[PDB]
Swiss-Prot record, chains A, B:
Glycans are attached at residue 36. Subunit of the fusion protein that is processed upon entry into the host cell. Mediates fusion of the virion and cellular membranes by functioning as a class I viral fusion protein. Contains a viral fusion peptide that is unmasked after S2 cleavage. This cleavage can occur at the cell membrane by host TMPRSS2 or during endocytosis by host CSTL. In either case, this triggers an extensive and irreversible conformational change that leads to fusion of the viral envelope with the cellular cytoplasmic membrane, releasing viral genomic RNA into the host cell cytoplasm. Changing residue 20 to H: In strain: Alpha/B.1.1.7. The chain holds residues 1099 to 1146 of 1273 of the full protein. This is Spike protein S2'. Changing residue 3 to Y: In strain: Theta/P.3.
């Protein structure tokens, strides 16, 4: 109800959405039901730090 | 005939060669029939930030 988490189908283990846990394919205008959220980039703070 | 791609066996989905889709093992003088090409590194362009 607040933030989108990634989890396995056999158990519930909250995990933050990241570029390592997701794959970039297609655009947002194809998938039906796609939702908007913030994908965390682990390299973003490393480059800024 | 232009650039080498990494695609699935059951489906043809051209994708640029990157360090995430492959792993470095052995050398170039062992594997038979190896070809020369360029591997895209996502960390190289991010160095400007």
């Amino acid at each position: 109800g607040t933030h989108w988490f990634v989890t396995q189908r056999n158990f519930y283990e909250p995990q933050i959405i990241t570029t390592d846990n997701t794959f970039v394919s297609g655009n947002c205008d194809v998938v039906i039901g796609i939702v908007n959220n913030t994908v965390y980039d682990p390299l973003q703070p490393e480059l800024d730090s």
